[PDB]
Amino acid sequence: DDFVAKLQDNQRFRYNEVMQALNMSAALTARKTKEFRSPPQEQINMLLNFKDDKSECPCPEEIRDQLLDFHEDLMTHCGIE
Amino acid sequence: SLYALGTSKSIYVERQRSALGECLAAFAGAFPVAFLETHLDKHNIYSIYNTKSSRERAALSLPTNVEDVCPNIPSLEKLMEEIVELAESGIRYTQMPHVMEVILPMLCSYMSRWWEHGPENNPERAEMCCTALNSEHMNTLLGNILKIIYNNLGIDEGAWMKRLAVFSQPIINKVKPQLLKTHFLPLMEKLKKKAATVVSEEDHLKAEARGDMSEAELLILDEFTTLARDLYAFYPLLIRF
Amino acid sequence: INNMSFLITDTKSKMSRKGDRYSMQTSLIVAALKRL
Amino acid sequence: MADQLTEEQIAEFKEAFSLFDKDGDGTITTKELGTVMRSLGQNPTEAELQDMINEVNGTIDFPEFLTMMARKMKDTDSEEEIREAFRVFDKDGNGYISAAELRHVMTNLGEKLTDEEVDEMIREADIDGQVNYEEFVQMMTA
């Protein structure tokens, strides 16, 4: 619940500065709107693509840290480590 | 009223100068009395000072003086002398904006209208013609236009070049062919120098391309736009000549 | 600029939609070149 | 109703239909077929009712009814389909999209499809390069 709330807020903010800097970016506008023109399932799939390196993920570091901490806690609960 | 509008130096009339000049040119074309050349008035059969007679003209509100019916408008010879010293004395646009927007198009239309009644077309019963206009006046004024646009290629880029180009279209009809060597050769020579400069600059700029060429390619684009604007001010006259 | 207006004014004394605004074929430069 | 309808509007369809309720078959006959959406808020004409009765033992239920608003979903699809485009692009609003802006609107996003743009310009090409975004989109949003 909270993770998706924060992720949606960050995506809205990112789209905001992308729209603000559209005319400076010019050619970069298409590549920044590629994220927002993809179906929501693929949007979440590519937003959750930071499990291993792969800096091709718009997710910020704090949100990444939240997800990683929860994943580690869940693995501990499951008894993997 | 229209001549005072054209000659007036005011920020209010500044942005409407062009329309007033066009209206004055149209009126000069339409008006049947040679108002610029008042001295030979008596040979005009349509003149009010030739038809209405002294008693009726005094009954009406007329200055009774042919030279003073339109005192503010100078004589054609004086206008010719002024334009001749322009484009030759190094004209500054701060004091001379009105001239090439109002006064020259009026003279162009006046010449186009009054050439037919000039003595050169009908040398029979000469010196009784309504106007003293001549093909040599036409050549002199066209050379003056060529010289002023020559001086104004790179300075004061505006719509008045294409305006003067379309207004002076009728003048070219009765030009001597030697005006080519007289003025067109330096004019097109300088245009070709500008074209060579801009194409060389384009070739130099094509080598480099990065994030920030904008601060140079905008200037180069301005160069091409100015060159094309001068080219369209030029080639009608040359083509039709 | 009508572009062709200069030629129309020239041929006016002798009485001589899709492309109303502008046309490739009637460029002023190529017209001058073909006249010379 | 293939997930294009939103939860809030589906819920208010149900609340209007439950205004007559009665086990999903009672008080919802062809006599109230118009009354339910008259109370909901938009007015069904003879064309709307014939669209309701085109494919319709004789007494509707909620699946059939919301199936009817699926084909009525076809209504009011003129301004909101281009509202998003007008918000995202066309700040000037002229509709005559500039040259770079048109590169950018057909900068392929993920699909990377080809021959469709060159097909569109070989089938139709504007003149004055200078492609119109309006004429460009009504052809698909007919």
Side-chain angles (χ1 to χ4, degrees), chain A, chain B, chain C, chain D residues 1-31 33-63 65-100 102-125 127-142:
Chain A
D1 170 80
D2 168 72
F3 186 74
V4 165
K6 287 167 170 164
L7 194 64
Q8 273 177 338
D9 293 0
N10 179 256
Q11 182 173 1
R12 201 186 294 260
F13 163 76
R14 281 189 292 110
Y15 168 91
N16 292 336
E17 78 273 9
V18 167
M19 295 298 102
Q20 296 304 106
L22 193 149
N23 48 59
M24 283 73 74
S25 287
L28 187 153
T29 288
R31 296 290 70 74
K32 255 54 178 176
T33 195
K34 163 71 181 295
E35 168 170 6
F36 313 131
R37 297 301 96 196
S38 180
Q41 181 74 271
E42 201 267 356
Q43 299 184 39
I44 282 184
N45 292 345
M46 65 182 179
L47 268 162
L48 292 188
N49 202 359
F50 58 92
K51 188 157 185 234
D52 63 358
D53 58 11
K54 193 70 168 65
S55 80
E56 288 79 32
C57 186
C59 183
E61 182 65 26
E62 58 273 16
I63 303 176
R64 288 176 197 220
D65 291 324
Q66 281 193 207
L67 186 46
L68 288 171
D69 296 340
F70 176 79
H71 184 83
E72 189 271 331
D73 278 355
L74 180 70
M75 290 302 103
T76 306
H77 204 273
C78 289
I80 313 299
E81 323 203 340
Chain B
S1 300
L2 269 171
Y3 198 87
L5 288 165
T7 310
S8 178
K9 299 181 291 294
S10 176
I11 55 174
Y12 292 165
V13 70
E14 176 66 28
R15 65 179 64 88
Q16 286 99 18
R17 287 182 189 274
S18 170
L20 304 162
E22 186 265 313
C23 191
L24 193 60
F27 181 76
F31 194 59
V33 191
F35 52 96
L36 292 175
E37 283 150 323
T38 63
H39 55 266
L40 72 164
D41 49 354
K42 61 187 73 63
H43 287 317
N44 183 15
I45 62 171
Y46 302 123
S47 170
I48 193 60
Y49 280 144
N50 295 28
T51 58
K52 192 56 74 179
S53 73
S54 67
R55 179 69 251 150
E56 288 80 2
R57 87 178 73 266
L60 291 172
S61 178
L62 294 174
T64 309
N65 265 328
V66 191
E67 185 68 27
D68 290 331
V69 65
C70 58
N72 296 115
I73 297 89
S75 177
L76 187 142
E77 325 294 331
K78 293 188 286 185
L79 294 174
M80 295 298 60
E81 287 153 35
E82 290 160 271
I83 290 184
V84 162
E85 62 94 15
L86 275 73
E88 194 271 333
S89 296
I91 294 314
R92 180 68 66 192
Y93 181 76
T94 57
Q95 66 266 25
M96 295 298 102
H98 57 287
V99 186
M100 73 291 291
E101 295 179 325
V102 175
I103 312 180
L104 288 80
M106 183 278 288
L107 289 177
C108 301
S109 185
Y110 182 94
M111 293 178 127
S112 177
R113 186 256 184 274
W114 274 115
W115 181 65
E116 291 87 50
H117 300 272
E120 60 274 16
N121 281 167
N122 58 6
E124 63 274 17
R125 80 288 183 276
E127 287 288 310
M128 283 73 74
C129 294
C130 294
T131 181
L133 183 63
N134 193 252
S135 66
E136 64 88 19
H137 301 92
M138 294 177 70
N139 296 115
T140 295
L141 188 153
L142 185 62
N144 290 318
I145 297 166
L146 292 171
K147 204 179 45 183
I148 190 167
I149 190 157
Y150 176 107
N151 308 318
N152 283 316
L153 277 296
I155 49 173
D156 191 11
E157 288 84 307
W160 44 275
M161 283 73 74
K162 69 181 70 68
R163 259 190 291 262
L164 288 178
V166 71
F167 288 59
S168 310
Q169 183 66 254
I171 297 170
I172 318 169
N173 55 4
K174 299 295 114 175
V175 191
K176 280 73 176 175
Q178 308 100 339
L179 183 63
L180 188 153
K181 184 257 185 181
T182 302
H183 292 89
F184 293 99
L185 287 179
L187 185 85
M188 295 298 102
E189 185 76 342
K190 198 171 89 168
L191 167 72
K192 170 53 56 189
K193 299 289 95 175
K194 205 197 159 150
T197 304
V198 301
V199 301
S200 63
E201 278 162 303
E202 186 184 2
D203 186 55
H204 180 74
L205 183 68
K206 286 331 179 61
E208 57 185 2
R210 60 189 173 96
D212 289 326
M213 73 291 291
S214 292
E215 290 296 330
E217 61 86 20
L218 261 181
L219 272 74
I220 307 302
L221 194 146
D222 290 328
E223 291 178 351
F224 293 104
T225 51
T226 51
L227 176 83
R229 192 181 217 175
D230 300 315
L231 185 138
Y232 279 1
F234 292 164
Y235 287 171
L237 309 171
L238 182 70
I239 279 173
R240 186 237 190 226
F241 181 76
Chain C
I1 288 172
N2 188 241
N3 297 113
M4 283 73 74
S5 69
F6 305 131
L7 291 173
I8 293 300
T9 46
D10 196 46
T11 68
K12 177 180 210 254
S13 68
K14 284 86 173 177
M15 183 278 288
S16 179
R17 277 86 66 192
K18 62 182 183 294
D20 54 352
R21 315 284 298 260
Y22 176 68
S23 65
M24 295 298 102
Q25 189 64 254
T26 68
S27 292
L28 269 297
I29 298 100
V30 305
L33 181 87
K34 73 179 181 180
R35 295 294 87 193
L36 293 165
Chain D
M1 66 182 72
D3 277 333
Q4 82 267 12
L5 292 149
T6 66
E7 183 173 343
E8 190 50 25
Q9 65 183 177
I10 271 168
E12 60 88 18
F13 290 28
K14 184 60 143 121
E15 72 92 20
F17 198 40
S18 329
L19 294 174
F20 293 118
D21 55 67
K22 293 295 290 218
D23 64 358
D25 284 327
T27 70
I28 61 170
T29 60
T30 58
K31 276 74 69 177
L33 188 55
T35 304
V36 328
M37 71 264 327
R38 274 185 295 153
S39 74
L40 188 152
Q42 40 293 346
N43 171 61
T45 67
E46 267 71 15
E48 273 75 4
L49 65 85
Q50 158 308 343
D51 292 331
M52 295 296 172
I53 94 144
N54 54 4
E55 284 85 14
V56 66
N57 195 11
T59 72
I60 62 170
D61 59 358
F62 186 63
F65 180 73
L66 182 130
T67 309
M68 320 288 145
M69 286 41 82
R71 304 185 308 278
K72 273 303 174 187
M73 174 57 199
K74 297 289 96 176
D75 297 339
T76 74
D77 285 329
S78 190
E79 209 266 333
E80 95 277 10
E81 63 189 355
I82 196 166
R83 151 98 250 151
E84 193 275 332
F86 284 154
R87 186 273 304 278
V88 65
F89 298 151
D90 290 305
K91 280 83 184 175
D92 296 331
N94 52 1
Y96 274 12
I97 61 171
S98 76
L102 64 86
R103 257 42 36 185
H104 289 162
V105 295
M106 251 67 107
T107 294
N108 285 327
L109 308 172
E111 272 289 336
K112 189 175 175 66
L113 273 180
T114 187
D115 207 338
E116 59 96 17
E117 63 274 13
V118 66
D119 268 331
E120 278 151 345
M121 285 40 82
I122 65 175
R123 286 194 292 266
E124 53 94 19
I127 197 72
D128 59 337
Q130 184 62 255
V131 180
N132 195 0
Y133 183 179
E134 285 300 274
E135 295 298 323
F136 211 52
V137 297
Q138 293 84 18
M139 66 181 180
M140 70 263 262
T141 61

